[PDB]
């Protein structure tokens, strides 16, 4: 999007899933791909692949275990306009741990299970659930 290229991808993921699409496409980033790894390895989505040189477009292959989607509700938290940063202990829990958060830690982007084990807080990218 013109001012939030990451809430834009999240909106892609949970618009193209109300419509029940198999796969969605968007112009990729480095942070977009860094997220996509954390999504696709916590099983929130099948697998992705980025492709393109002048216009490297990210395409996620959405997942769903029934008519229901596996991704219930992703929430963009650290909006440009209100940047949200947390410490290693005040890291949010999503659905009391059932769902995943995505934070930008000094050692990269990861979940909060792993960034709470790693003892290193971050920048709350989005709640994944």
């Amino acid at each position: 999007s013109m001012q939030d290229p990451i809430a834009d991808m999240l909106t892609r993921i949970r618009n193209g899933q109300a419509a029940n699409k198999a796969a969605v496409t968007m112009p990729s980033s480095k942070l977009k791909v860094a997220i996509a790894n954390v999504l696709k390895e916590e099983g929130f989505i099948e697998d992705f692949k980025v492709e393109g040189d002048t216009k490297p477009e990210l395409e996620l292959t959405l997942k769903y275990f029934q008519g229901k989607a596996v991704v219930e509700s992703i929430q963009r938290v650290s909006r440009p306009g209100l940047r949200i940063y947390k410490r290693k202990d005040e890291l949010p829990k999503v659905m009391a741990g059932l769902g995943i958060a995505v934070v930008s830690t000094s050692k990269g982007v990861m979940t909060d299970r792993a960034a709470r084990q790693a003892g290193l807080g971050g920048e709350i990218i989005c709640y994944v659930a």
Partner: protein, 80 residues
């Protein structure tokens, strides 16, 4: 050498003195938005040797005049 508050000189007209404007984030205590709060502060420059708009490195000294308690150690940018 205490923290050598980097700043950008606003007005080098006044004799042997300048006005350095420090800029700072601070998270807004009640709303949470990182706001930009400037810290304008008079600096004694001994030779009028810095022109408007160059980042300098200033230090705390004893008061040197009414409302002038900072002198700079060294300049790290040219005005233009």
């Amino acid at each position: 050498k205490i923290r050598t508050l980097q700043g950008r000189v606003v007005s080098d007209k006044m004799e042997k003195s300048i006005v350095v404007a420090i800029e700072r984030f601070v998270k807004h205590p009640i709303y949470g938005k990182f706001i930009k709060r400037t810290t304008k502060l008079h600096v004694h420059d001994e030779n009028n040797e810095c022109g408007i708009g160059d980042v300098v490195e200033i230090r705390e000294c004893r008061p040197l005049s009414k409302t002038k308690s900072w002198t700079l150690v060294r300049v790290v940018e040219k005005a233009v």
